[PDB]
Amino acid sequence: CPLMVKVLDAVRGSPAINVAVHVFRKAADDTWEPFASGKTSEPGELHGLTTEEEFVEGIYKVEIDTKSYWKALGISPFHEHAEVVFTANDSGPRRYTIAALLSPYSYSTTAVVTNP
Amino acid sequence: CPLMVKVLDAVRGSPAINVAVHVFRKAADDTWEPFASGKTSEPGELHGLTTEEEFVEGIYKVEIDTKSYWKALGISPFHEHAEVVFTANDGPRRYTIAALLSPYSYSTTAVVTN
């Protein structure tokens, strides 16, 4: 599992469940082509986005739908989404975990990168 | 102001100086239209991006060139940039976008005041 996403809610102190996540990859013509998407599970994790074969080198964007998340909770948040953009696999395959910590007017994101 | 950006560097414990910031406004076609840009000053701040008259309700993206910043310091970065996307909605409001940068992590916060 070369790409995983973990989302936490800093208001409730809990995993962020049913958060939509969309991954794009930058194409040769400099547009964003859809790559993979999914939703977080009860533990706030999203596995199985992609495979070692599909996850080639590239510039990737992970768009986490934080606005829908807050609105489902009856909250009016500031950000449209949390977008995380990075070059992947440039020095060979790595495993990437993208973590995001959500508040209504703030987010943080961290990358953990390991060598499989 | 109506819009300010503040950037801090969590590795050196200092304002992030000379960071490029570009602001885009979403156009009718779902594409991103340049709107304002500049470079943070010694205190890590960028004022004067826009004016009350120009800054209408809409969806804005603020893209902070964190990769160039870390390269300039000889520090190896993860992200291409940090992009902060939000809807501006109109009582009297001023927006400050604050960002805290590490090579493999960033946080951003909106401070919205009257």
Place this chain on the structure above:
Amino acid sequence: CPLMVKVLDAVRGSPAINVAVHVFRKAADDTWEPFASGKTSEPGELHGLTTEEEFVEGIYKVEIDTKSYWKALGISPFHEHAEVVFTANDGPRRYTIAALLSPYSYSTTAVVTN
């Protein structure tokens, strides 16, 4: 300044106003001696804690009463407070302790400038 504290609220997107802050200096016995305190102002800032003459090298703790702050807003908190512990070491330096508060998370950063 020599020592300033800045506090932001990530839930409401605003400066954290009227937050109690206590600063302690570590004494010879490994105990914490009160040193300075105050309440953040409208812009979420607390200036005037100490003076150049008073603020000597040593180990300091800044304890921000986040629990009282969230209670005052009717928001349920996790932490008792946020305590930021650091050694001050003397070229010319000013320290700003910045904190960003959520009910179950906080971040703190030191901004050390000349």
Place this chain on the structure above:
Amino acid sequence: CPLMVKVLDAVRGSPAINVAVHVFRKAADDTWEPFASGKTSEPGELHGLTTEEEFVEGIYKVEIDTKSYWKALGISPFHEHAEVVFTANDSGPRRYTIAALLSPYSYSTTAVVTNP
């Protein structure tokens, strides 16, 4: 496992390994009594600090030795430690994960609290 601690390094994008963690509990006389301690593993996690029987209600302090961590890496950090203080189990037993994200001049900490 009612109390777990996870530590990440935001400079390297990696788990923070061999980080000392000390837990204290506030005593009846208002002093901090030692409670449990340990070191993070390769994944940056510290399990087995305590048990359901030992982890009673109380005010707890988790002191993460972030200064030693940075110094071992040849880095001079700002903070002495990252200390996280909280009331536990007040409405019955919970499972607590205390996560910390480390930079040389900054840290963040988050609590994830679940109902076992």
